């Protein structure tokens, strides 16, 4: 399952600052034997690498959105709450809203 | 019965600060034998599901609510009263408006 | 008879500070024989009911009110007078009003 | 019962100068026989615990409040009032007020 | 007949220095048969009871009190004057405010 | 469990002077044999490197505080109260406010 | 790792005085035989190059700072937390900020 | 029980002329076998270590107190006394007041 | 450690007439050999160069003092009292308060 997620990096008054558009792979998964108890999650791997890519952020200081039907970026943060952000992929295109975590 | 909570959080002058959309099971219960006397409520385990999603409160410190037909912010903590609440889920979504417990 | 009540919690200005509505059965009343003299009264069982469900107050601290046609919050403690108060039921939305009882 | 105490250290014109916030288990209590006649007493053990955690007082030289509905400090010192002053709290948080015994 | 009584004990310029909220049984009375003659009175009952709670008065050295319509400390200490002073109680709250007796 | 401490400095009327931003491992522990009792407190551990830090202050002479929902600063120095100060973690920083120990 | 460090020398109200814009090699190191100890820290040998260049400042008296994400002049003098300072490279540009140390 | 003793000497009109601050070691106590009956007392190595320090006063020459809860001072000069002394200690400071013996 | 004291001589109200500011070498110490049995003391040679530096002065004749966290100047005589004054130092300066030795 090849999916593509377009992170969109928001600015001031939720203007996109920076767009990255990397590739994940959520359903595919490593070799079928343990080699730990089960990786990272697929939200835990999604967040270390939106990370990595991004210069201008941190990894453990920024907040990953989504637009669900009624236009609101709703976060998630879970990966059983992942699964649910990614029944709105459209085409291949998973797209992720990323906010940094400010003072208050 | 899978039933989809969207947990609003809301801010200075009730303005949405975070959104959490996850799936709640109400009417759906476990095992039907008694490892207790019945479980927690089903408000009681709606609590602890919000409490445990977002990151910015602590449970026992919020109070959650509903929009009833005059659009007040109706709040609910009971049982009882969660089944008055969960009369206006309009088509799967049931939308919940949390207030964190300030000094008065 | 199945009656919605919609406890308003008043604040400073007379500004709604915490909605509840529950629901209350004035007229329904319990099994045709005297366990007792006749139970509490269909005042007594509103307030007791009020006092339960909102933890912001304590039994026995708080006046309830209506509007009458004037715009007025009338006040009721008497239950030969919570049968005028219900004479203004809308729908099946009984609103009441409640104050606390501060210094003077 | 799980209940917070969160002890305001009043100073000069009643302005807090020291808070303390710990947590108190009156209702709870110890194993079911008699090893004592029945412990010290739930405001004994509470003042005891005041007295335990600021390094600011010593005890028995402090009198513990809260504020009634009048906004008035009112004192305790019994254990028979102590149940009047918990009949006060508003979520879990039983706020007491505590003034130093000085000259006259 | 259970009465609240906020037993205030005022200081030099008639403002109140302790406050101690207690609750009050007049009305009620023990087992319907003579042990005694009848008891103490109802007012000896009261000054037994403000003398208990307080550490900063001994019995038979302090005068309680309550205010009338016009504002003033009416003195009480009679138990068929006590029965006047109780009906001014507001809602279940029978204020009394102490003060001792000092020279002259 | 890397957890980051953001240690405020505050100075006349309680503005910060000085911000020190370290990384703290209260619940991570050594080597699980006893070459002591069992080492410091987590407490004690964390006054221990607070003032290791600030040039500006010598140990034992600084009072560690946190924010409640109150917004009040609230005091810790037990080792018990300190597991309730560190259930205000936000994300990971756990923000406390030091204040030194003056004449009275 | 060739690292840009870009010394902010603050002001009366925490405004730029005078910047300076050097390089700085704290992840390269000298020949890989032991003439010393280990040499000075690599926060001991920034301090000493932020004094060789300002004429404006004599070593020992200067407090260098960042910004965290909070917006806040974080200071740093150890090496273990001049680690946790360069985290917060953005480019290849290390921006500190610079304060003396005057009388209290 | 590391414990640090800051001796006031008082002047005049009760006003400080030299204050000291060593330190004191009253429940530490040296090797556990009687090389004498018992040492001197815990407060006789007081009074000899504040007539060591200052040179303005002579052993047997001088009266030490301590400031109680109201603000008076308490002189002491025995072992039994100086328990009672020391349960006033804020911090670890044990601030003695010394006033010389004079004519009458 | 090269240490900086910054010696004040303090006037008729406390007001600072001559300011000194000299280097001092407490921790250092000569040759690792007895010529003597161990040299002066670490305070006997602090006064000793306040006292070779101030024209002003004569040695034996001023007493050296510190500021506690009280604000308070400390008096200072004693080796194991300057052990105790130099845990107060700030950068690397020991700010010392140098009086005269009147009448009275």
Do not use: N, W
């Not at 990272?40 to 669900?68: I, K, N, T």
């Amino acid at each position: 399952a090849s999916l593509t997620v377009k992170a969109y990096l928001l600015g001031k008054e939720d203007a996109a600052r920076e767009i990255r558009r990397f590739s994940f792979c959520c359903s595919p998964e490593p070799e079928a034997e343990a080699e730990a108890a089960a990786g990272p999650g697929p939200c835990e791997r999604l967040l270390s690498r939106v990370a990595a890519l991004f210069p201008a952020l941190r990894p453990g200081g920024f907040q990953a959105h989504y637009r669900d039907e009624d236009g609101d970026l709703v976060a998630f943060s879970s990966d059983e709450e992942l699964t649910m952000a990614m029944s709105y992929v459209k085409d291949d295109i998973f797209r992720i809203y990323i906010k940094e975590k400010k003072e208050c």
